[PDB]
Design a binder for this molecule. Structure first.
Ligand code: GNP
Ligand code: MG
Ligand code: ZN
Lengths: 38, 307, 141
RNA sequence: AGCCAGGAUGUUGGCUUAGAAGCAGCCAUCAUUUAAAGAAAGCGUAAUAGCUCACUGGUCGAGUCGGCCUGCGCGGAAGA
RNA sequence: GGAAGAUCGUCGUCUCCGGUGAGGCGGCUGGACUUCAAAUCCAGUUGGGGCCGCCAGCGGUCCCGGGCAGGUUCGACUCCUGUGAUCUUCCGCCA
């Protein structure tokens, strides 16, 4: 989790999802890549 | 009838000794503070019969092994306590191997924790012990299954205790004493306690203390909580001695004996018996009764070695 | 002898039986007898020349041994010792390591021809030579 | 697009050797078995096993790929 | 004895170091070395071991050396576990 304003994809398993209207990044295999509010 | 108790730690060996003798083995505050037998403690069982069997409780720890090695000198009989809960422990098997190598004439296996286990486990551990005896080349052994807190096996144990030989010694042997615990009592000097390998001693006798290299007159002695004018080999001997020697030079594993030894030698040959063969010129611990040494072994013909 | 378990084509030079520093325990991790990798290891070793780092297939099973077959010497060092000049470049376009001719390597490689893939003999020839030319040597043509 | 399967061998590849073998790089910058096979796009690891992916097949059955101009909205946006 | 701690090279001190051991510092022995010094390097601290020819009073073999042993780990003085040894401090030495 990090609130950085630019949430570019980092691994192939990273995928954008819009939850509660804010978009998220979740890299299934690699938790550290998880991001917020791009 | 000296019976030294050995076995893996906290398997009731102290409880057994309080059951038979009721002696408090602890002496140093730390072992009192920590509740374990950190170091050797002694029990004795005086009787109207006039013999006092000797009891030596020892740590089952390898770092503490150097003290147990202090206690294994002069044993008449060895009793390895084994809790029925886990059966024989690895420390117990180690002690069994050490007794087989030392050539102890006989040893008794005493099974504890018997009340907590069902009898089926009793017979199973009994079988397992009787198999292990053959593994170590043990001949006679009398297995006693008992809850020492309950006093269960006491009567069965008694007959065996009376069976145990006290070693005889020929009158013609140079007196030899292995020092164990040197502690002054405020009365009358040093009194150092140790096992007598051979010979008799009296208060008028002069002895020769090794490692201090000084003669020492005997002030007094107690045979086994049994003060007397004379002492014979085959028991722990409290020995109160005078002379120029002082505790700073005194060391456990120093010998007290009738005449000045020729000076100690590092090199020695030894017959080997081993569960598996040793290799030439390798570092190892030499452990002798009350003696720690470090040395390298070498192989000569077959089960012959140079230390 | 059984379904796939261990085997891959990897081993050191044929002069080192059961190597300890690059490998040691790593070769003993599974249940093949160590003897296979020392005594039977010299079988292909001195059969040709000592210390040919031929990869060997050994499917370690729990069922005593596995068939010994030390097959193909690696082409890389084979294009060193066979050419005779062990040195090279690693700079394919930036320098020319040297030159041999079709007569040596094209004849040498045929010993491996039974195992090497190819449509025809020359499919293997250009395939090795395209690798050998890319080794920085410019072979005669 | 899923689903089902493949996705080589000389490959511990010249240098440079703890070892970099598709997996920093010297350099991989070939070609070939056939469907291609990246002298390799990810990770795993000292690098190989290991799985993947690009890539080439099979099932499926009607629409589908990735950008440019774009108009309007979202985050970035905390004070008494 | 017990608990905890420091140290244990390959001449000493230190930096160390997991890529294969190296280096900074130092004392001394000489050489190159001057009238002596000083300095620079060189050369060197040569170490041990089972065994050998031995008493050869020594010299070799192979092997090893960060006290020694053990394991990693792919590879250890290097990481770590022990092991003692010396060394620091403290707990009690109760026939
Ligand atoms: N159920 C049961 N438990 C027992 C018996 N005897 C001893 N124990 C257990 O053993 C514990 C005491 O062990 P102790 O005798 O001090 O051990 P130790 O073997 O003498 N110590 P060390 O080996 O160092 O000399 C008691 O707390 C008790 O739980 C017994 O007869 N029955
Ligand atoms: Mg006890
Ligand atoms: Zn990512």
């Amino acid at each position: 989790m990090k609130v950085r304003a630019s949430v570019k994809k980092l691994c192939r398993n990273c995928k954008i999802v819009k939850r509660d209207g804010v978009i998220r990044v979740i890299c299934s295999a690699e938790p550290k890549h998880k991001q917020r509010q791009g | 009838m000296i019976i030294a108790t050995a076995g893996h730690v906290d398997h009731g060996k102290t409880t057994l000794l309080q059951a038979i003798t009721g002696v408090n083995a602890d002496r140093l505050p730390e072992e009192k503070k920590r509740g374990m037998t950190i170091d050797l403690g002694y029990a004795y069982w005086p009787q109207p019969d006039g013999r006092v069997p000797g009891f030596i409780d020892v740590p089952g720890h390898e770092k503490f092994l150097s003290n147990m090695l202090a206690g294994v000198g002069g044993i008449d009989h060895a009793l390895l306590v084994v809790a029925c809960d886990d059966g024989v422990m690895a420390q117990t098997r180690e002690h069994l191997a050490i007794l087989q190598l030392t050539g102890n004439p006989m040893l008794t296996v005493a099974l504890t924790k018997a009340d907590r286990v069902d009898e089926a486990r009793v017979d199973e551990v009994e079988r397992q012990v009787k198999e292990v005896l053959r593994e170590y080349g043990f001949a006679e052994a009398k297995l006693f299954i008992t809850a020492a807190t309950e006093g269960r096996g006491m009567d069965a144990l008694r007959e065996h205790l009376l069976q145990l030989p006290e070693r005889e010694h020929a009158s013609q042997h140079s007196f030899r004493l292995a020092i164990d615990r040197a502690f002054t009592v405020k009365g009358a000097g040093l009194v150092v306690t140790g096992t007598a390998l051979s010979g008799e001693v009296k208060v008028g006798d002069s002895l020769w203390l090794t490692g201090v290299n000084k003669p020492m007159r005997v002030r007094a002695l107690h045979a086994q909580n049994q003060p007397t004018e004379t002492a014979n080999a085959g028991q722990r001997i409290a020995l109160n001695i005078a002379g120029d020697a002082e505790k700073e030079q005194i060391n456990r594993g120093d010998w007290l004996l009738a005449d000045v030894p020729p000076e100690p030698f590092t090199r020695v040959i030894v017959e080997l018996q081993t569960h598996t063969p040793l290799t030439q010129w390798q570092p190892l611990h030499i452990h002798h009764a009350a003696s720690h040494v470090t040395g390298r072994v070498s192989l000569l013909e077959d089960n012959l070695a140079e230390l | 002898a059984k379904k796939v378990q261990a085997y891959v084509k990897l081993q050191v030079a044929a002069g080192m039986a059961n190597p300890s520093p690059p490998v040691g325990p790593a070769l003993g991790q599974q249940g093949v007898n160590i003897m296979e990798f020392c005594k039977a290891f010299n079988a292909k070793t001195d059969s040709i020349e000592k210390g040919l780092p031929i990869p060997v297939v050994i499917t370690v099973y729990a069922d005593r041994s596995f068939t010994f077959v030390t097959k193909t010497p690696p082409a890389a060092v084979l294009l060193k010792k066979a050419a005779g000049i062990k040195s090279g470049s690693g700079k394919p376009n930036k320098d020319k390591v040297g030159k041999i001719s079709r007569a040596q390597l094209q004849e040498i490689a045929q010993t491996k021809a039974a195992d090497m893939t190819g449509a025809d003999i020359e499919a293997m020839t250009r395939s090795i030579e395209g690798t050998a030319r890319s080794m920085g040597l410019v072979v005669e043509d």
